[PDB]
Curated annotation (Swiss-Prot):
Disulfide bond residue pairs: 31-47, 39-110, 135-204, 167-183, 194-222
UniProt gene name: PLAU
Active site (catalytic residues): 46 (charge relay system), 97 (charge relay system), 198 (charge relay system)
Organism name: Homo sapiens
Modification Phosphoserine, positions: 145
Domain Peptidase S1: 1-246
Protein name: Urokinase-type plasminogen activator chain B
Carbohydrate attachment residues: 144
Amino acid sequence: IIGGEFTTIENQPWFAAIYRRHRGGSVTYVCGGSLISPCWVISATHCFIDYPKKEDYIVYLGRSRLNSNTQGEMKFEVENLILHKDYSADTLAHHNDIALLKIRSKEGRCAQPSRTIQTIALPSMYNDPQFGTSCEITGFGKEQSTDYLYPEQLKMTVVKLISHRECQQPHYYGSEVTTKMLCAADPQWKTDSCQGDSGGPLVCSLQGRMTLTGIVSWGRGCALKDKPGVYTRVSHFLPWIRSHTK
Ligand SMILES: N=C(N)c1ccc2cc(/C=C/c3cccc(CCO)c3)ccc2c1
Protein backbone atom coordinates (compact mmCIF):
# COMPACT_ATOMS: atom_id res chain seq x y z
CA ILE A 1 0.00 0.00 0.00
CA ILE A 2 1.37 3.38 -1.19
CA GLY A 3 0.49 6.10 1.32
CA GLY A 4 -2.44 5.36 3.57
CA GLU A 5 -1.91 4.47 7.23
CA PHE A 6 -0.44 1.72 9.38
CA THR A 7 -3.17 -0.40 11.00
CA THR A 8 -3.63 -3.56 13.08
CA ILE A 9 -5.55 -6.80 12.49
CA GLU A 10 -8.38 -5.73 14.93
CA ASN A 11 -9.46 -3.15 12.32
CA GLN A 12 -9.26 -5.67 9.39
CA PRO A 13 -10.20 -9.07 11.08
CA TRP A 14 -11.11 -10.82 7.83
CA PHE A 15 -7.56 -10.14 6.58
CA ALA A 16 -5.54 -13.28 5.70
CA ALA A 17 -1.73 -13.19 5.40
CA ILE A 18 -0.52 -15.83 2.86
CA TYR A 19 3.10 -17.09 2.74
CA ARG A 20 5.00 -19.73 0.82
CA ARG A 21 7.51 -22.24 2.13
CA HIS A 22 10.48 -22.73 -0.20
CA ARG A 23 12.80 -25.76 -0.48
CA GLY A 24 15.34 -25.34 2.33
CA GLY A 25 12.68 -24.04 4.71
CA SER A 26 12.64 -20.28 4.09
CA VAL A 27 9.21 -18.63 4.19
CA THR A 28 8.29 -15.51 2.15
CA TYR A 29 5.12 -13.41 1.97
CA VAL A 30 2.99 -14.00 -1.18
CA CYS A 31 -0.34 -12.19 -1.10
CA GLY A 32 -3.30 -11.13 1.01
CA GLY A 33 -6.63 -12.87 1.35
CA SER A 34 -10.08 -12.53 2.94
CA LEU A 35 -11.86 -14.90 5.30
CA ILE A 36 -15.38 -15.49 3.81
CA SER A 37 -16.40 -18.41 6.08
CA PRO A 38 -14.36 -20.17 8.87
CA CYS A 39 -12.86 -22.78 6.43
CA TRP A 40 -12.48 -20.47 3.41
CA VAL A 41 -10.11 -17.73 2.37
CA ILE A 42 -10.70 -15.94 -0.93
CA SER A 43 -7.70 -14.45 -2.83
CA ALA A 44 -6.41 -14.05 -6.45
CA THR A 45 -5.35 -16.94 -8.73
CA HIS A 46 -2.31 -14.93 -10.03
CA CYS A 47 -0.76 -15.29 -6.53
CA PHE A 48 -0.61 -19.15 -6.88
CA ILE A 49 -0.67 -20.05 -10.59
CA ASP A 50 3.13 -20.48 -10.89
CA TYR A 51 3.46 -22.44 -7.59
CA PRO A 52 0.18 -24.42 -7.45
CA LYS A 53 1.16 -26.88 -4.68
CA LYS A 54 -1.24 -26.42 -1.77
CA GLU A 55 1.34 -27.89 0.77
CA ASP A 56 3.69 -24.89 0.18
CA TYR A 57 1.32 -22.30 1.62
CA ILE A 58 0.87 -20.94 5.14
CA VAL A 59 -2.20 -18.81 5.98
CA TYR A 60 -2.42 -16.64 9.05
CA LEU A 61 -5.52 -15.00 10.48
CA GLY A 62 -5.32 -12.42 13.30
CA ARG A 63 -1.76 -11.49 12.27
CA SER A 64 -0.87 -7.73 12.34
CA ARG A 65 2.82 -7.91 11.46
CA LEU A 66 4.79 -9.60 8.67
CA ASN A 67 7.29 -11.13 11.10
CA SER A 68 5.50 -11.18 14.49
CA ASN A 69 3.33 -13.83 16.06
CA THR A 70 0.45 -11.44 16.93
CA GLN A 71 -1.35 -12.45 20.13
CA GLY A 72 -4.52 -14.35 19.11
CA GLU A 73 -3.26 -15.23 15.63
CA MET A 74 -4.09 -18.62 14.06
CA LYS A 75 -1.79 -20.53 11.67
CA PHE A 76 -3.20 -22.74 8.87
CA GLU A 77 -2.31 -25.05 6.04
CA VAL A 78 -4.15 -25.22 2.75
CA GLU A 79 -6.49 -28.25 2.60
CA ASN A 80 -7.68 -27.31 -0.89
CA LEU A 81 -6.26 -24.71 -3.30
CA ILE A 82 -8.90 -23.78 -5.89
CA LEU A 83 -7.75 -21.74 -8.86
CA HIS A 84 -10.24 -20.40 -11.37
CA LYS A 85 -10.17 -22.69 -14.50
CA ASP A 86 -10.57 -19.61 -16.81
CA TYR A 87 -7.81 -17.55 -15.17
CA SER A 88 -5.56 -15.83 -17.72
CA ALA A 89 -3.06 -12.94 -17.89
CA ASP A 90 -2.58 -10.40 -20.62
CA THR A 91 0.24 -7.76 -20.65
CA LEU A 92 -1.67 -5.86 -17.91
CA ALA A 93 -5.10 -7.36 -17.33
CA HIS A 94 -5.66 -10.50 -15.26
CA HIS A 95 -8.92 -12.36 -16.04
CA ASN A 96 -10.91 -14.46 -13.52
CA ASP A 97 -8.35 -13.43 -10.89
CA ILE A 98 -9.96 -15.32 -8.03
CA ALA A 99 -8.89 -18.25 -5.86
CA LEU A 100 -10.31 -20.12 -2.88
CA LEU A 101 -8.13 -21.60 -0.11
CA LYS A 102 -9.71 -24.19 2.20
CA ILE A 103 -7.86 -23.72 5.51
CA ARG A 104 -6.95 -26.28 8.21
CA SER A 105 -5.03 -25.97 11.51
CA LYS A 106 -2.68 -28.86 12.37
CA GLU A 107 -5.64 -30.37 14.37
CA GLY A 108 -7.87 -30.35 11.29
CA ARG A 109 -9.92 -27.31 12.34
CA CYS A 110 -11.09 -24.21 10.57
CA ALA A 111 -10.84 -20.62 11.88
CA GLN A 112 -12.15 -19.84 15.36
CA PRO A 113 -13.89 -16.42 15.08
CA SER A 114 -12.67 -13.96 17.73
CA ARG A 115 -12.15 -10.19 18.17
CA THR A 116 -9.23 -10.35 15.64
CA ILE A 117 -10.59 -13.16 13.35
CA GLN A 118 -13.91 -12.45 11.61
CA THR A 119 -15.41 -13.16 8.21
CA ILE A 120 -16.28 -10.44 5.65
CA ALA A 121 -19.71 -10.59 3.97
CA LEU A 122 -19.88 -11.32 0.26
CA PRO A 123 -21.74 -8.86 -2.05
CA SER A 124 -25.18 -9.55 -3.51
CA MET A 125 -25.66 -9.94 -7.31
CA TYR A 126 -26.02 -6.71 -9.45
CA ASN A 127 -25.51 -4.62 -6.28
CA ASP A 128 -22.04 -3.03 -6.31
CA PRO A 129 -21.44 0.52 -4.92
CA GLN A 130 -21.83 3.44 -7.38
CA PHE A 131 -18.70 5.20 -8.78
CA GLY A 132 -17.24 7.79 -6.35
CA THR A 133 -17.89 5.48 -3.34
CA SER A 134 -15.02 5.39 -0.87
CA CYS A 135 -13.69 1.86 -0.18
CA GLU A 136 -10.79 0.53 1.84
CA ILE A 137 -7.86 -1.71 0.95
CA THR A 138 -5.57 -3.66 3.28
CA GLY A 139 -2.25 -5.34 2.71
CA PHE A 140 1.43 -5.93 3.47
CA GLY A 141 2.32 -4.77 -0.08
CA LYS A 142 5.00 -2.28 -1.18
CA GLU A 143 4.99 1.19 0.34
CA GLN A 144 6.83 2.45 -2.83
CA SER A 145 7.27 0.77 -6.26
CA THR A 146 11.08 1.21 -5.79
CA ASP A 147 11.00 -0.85 -2.53
CA TYR A 148 11.97 -4.54 -2.63
CA LEU A 149 10.98 -5.11 1.05
CA TYR A 150 7.39 -5.15 2.28
CA PRO A 151 6.31 -3.11 5.37
CA GLU A 152 6.59 -4.90 8.71
CA GLN A 153 3.25 -3.51 9.89
CA LEU A 154 -0.05 -4.00 8.08
CA LYS A 155 -1.30 -0.98 6.17
CA MET A 156 -4.64 0.22 4.91
CA THR A 157 -5.86 3.03 2.67
CA VAL A 158 -9.08 4.51 1.31
CA VAL A 159 -9.68 4.79 -2.48
CA LYS A 160 -12.73 5.81 -4.57
CA LEU A 161 -14.48 3.58 -7.11
CA ILE A 162 -14.09 4.66 -10.73
CA SER A 163 -16.84 3.94 -13.32
CA HIS A 164 -16.21 1.40 -16.14
CA ARG A 165 -16.57 4.15 -18.82
CA GLU A 166 -13.87 6.34 -17.13
CA CYS A 167 -11.63 3.33 -16.66
CA GLN A 168 -11.96 2.51 -20.41
CA GLN A 169 -10.70 5.98 -21.40
CA PRO A 170 -7.61 5.74 -23.70
CA HIS A 171 -5.25 7.35 -21.11
CA TYR A 172 -6.64 4.90 -18.44
CA TYR A 173 -6.91 1.25 -19.55
CA GLY A 174 -8.99 1.41 -22.76
CA SER A 175 -10.64 -1.94 -23.62
CA GLU A 176 -8.14 -3.88 -21.39
CA VAL A 177 -10.36 -3.29 -18.31
CA THR A 178 -13.62 -5.33 -18.54
CA THR A 179 -17.07 -5.24 -16.86
CA LYS A 180 -15.84 -8.17 -14.64
CA MET A 181 -13.26 -5.74 -13.12
CA LEU A 182 -13.59 -2.71 -10.84
CA CYS A 183 -11.29 0.30 -10.92
CA ALA A 184 -10.56 2.26 -7.75
CA ALA A 185 -8.06 5.01 -7.14
CA ASP A 186 -7.13 8.18 -5.29
CA PRO A 187 -8.39 11.34 -7.22
CA GLN A 188 -4.91 12.83 -6.33
CA TRP A 189 -3.01 9.58 -7.35
CA LYS A 190 -1.08 9.55 -3.97
CA THR A 191 -2.49 6.34 -2.45
CA ASP A 192 -3.05 2.90 -4.01
CA SER A 193 -2.52 -0.84 -3.65
CA CYS A 194 0.79 -2.19 -4.97
CA GLN A 195 2.81 -5.36 -5.47
CA GLY A 196 2.24 -7.66 -2.52
CA ASP A 197 -1.32 -6.35 -1.96
CA SER A 198 -2.76 -8.77 -4.58
CA GLY A 199 -5.42 -11.17 -3.39
CA GLY A 200 -6.31 -8.75 -0.59
CA PRO A 201 -9.65 -7.08 0.14
CA LEU A 202 -11.41 -4.07 -1.39
CA VAL A 203 -14.06 -3.54 1.31
CA CYS A 204 -16.98 -1.20 0.63
CA SER A 205 -19.60 -0.11 3.12
CA LEU A 206 -22.81 -0.51 1.13
CA GLN A 207 -26.28 0.13 2.60
CA GLY A 208 -24.68 0.09 6.08
CA ARG A 209 -23.11 -3.32 5.37
CA MET A 210 -19.35 -3.93 5.22
CA THR A 211 -18.87 -5.88 1.94
CA LEU A 212 -16.07 -7.71 0.07
CA THR A 213 -16.59 -5.77 -3.16
CA GLY A 214 -13.27 -6.56 -4.80
CA ILE A 215 -10.00 -8.49 -4.69
CA VAL A 216 -6.70 -6.67 -5.45
CA SER A 217 -5.81 -7.88 -8.96
CA TRP A 218 -3.76 -5.59 -11.26
CA GLY A 219 -2.60 -2.13 -12.21
CA ARG A 220 -0.05 -0.21 -14.28
CA GLY A 221 2.62 0.67 -11.70
CA CYS A 222 1.40 1.92 -8.29
CA ALA A 223 -0.36 5.27 -7.58
CA LEU A 224 0.37 6.36 -11.19
CA LYS A 225 -1.74 9.16 -12.72
CA ASP A 226 -4.69 7.75 -14.77
CA LYS A 227 -3.69 4.20 -13.75
CA PRO A 228 -6.24 2.98 -11.18
CA GLY A 229 -5.89 -0.22 -9.21
CA VAL A 230 -7.99 -2.95 -10.88
CA TYR A 231 -9.98 -5.38 -8.74
CA THR A 232 -11.85 -8.60 -9.35
CA ARG A 233 -15.60 -7.73 -9.13
CA VAL A 234 -16.61 -10.32 -6.49
CA SER A 235 -20.38 -9.92 -7.31
CA HIS A 236 -19.75 -11.53 -10.74
CA PHE A 237 -18.25 -14.63 -9.08
CA LEU A 238 -21.02 -15.50 -6.57
CA PRO A 239 -22.06 -18.65 -8.59
CA TRP A 240 -18.36 -19.75 -8.83
CA ILE A 241 -17.71 -19.10 -5.07
CA ARG A 242 -20.92 -20.92 -4.05
CA SER A 243 -20.23 -23.98 -6.27
CA HIS A 244 -16.56 -24.21 -5.15
CA THR A 245 -17.29 -23.86 -1.37
CA LYS A 246 -20.16 -26.46 -1.32
N1 LIG B 1 -1.87 -0.04 -9.12
C1 LIG B 1 -2.30 -1.10 -8.32
N2 LIG B 1 -3.23 -1.04 -7.50
C2 LIG B 1 -1.66 -2.47 -8.44
C3 LIG B 1 -2.47 -3.65 -8.11
C4 LIG B 1 -1.89 -4.89 -8.12
C5 LIG B 1 -0.50 -5.05 -8.50
C6 LIG B 1 0.09 -6.33 -8.59
C7 LIG B 1 1.43 -6.49 -8.92
C8 LIG B 1 1.97 -7.87 -9.03
C9 LIG B 1 3.27 -8.23 -9.27
C10 LIG B 1 3.75 -9.61 -9.43
C11 LIG B 1 2.91 -10.74 -9.64
C12 LIG B 1 3.42 -12.04 -9.62
C13 LIG B 1 4.77 -12.27 -9.39
C14 LIG B 1 5.64 -11.17 -9.20
C15 LIG B 1 7.10 -11.40 -8.98
C16 LIG B 1 7.33 -11.98 -7.54
O1 LIG B 1 7.65 -10.89 -6.70
C17 LIG B 1 5.13 -9.84 -9.23
C18 LIG B 1 2.24 -5.31 -9.24
C19 LIG B 1 1.68 -4.06 -9.21
C20 LIG B 1 0.28 -3.89 -8.82
C21 LIG B 1 -0.33 -2.60 -8.78
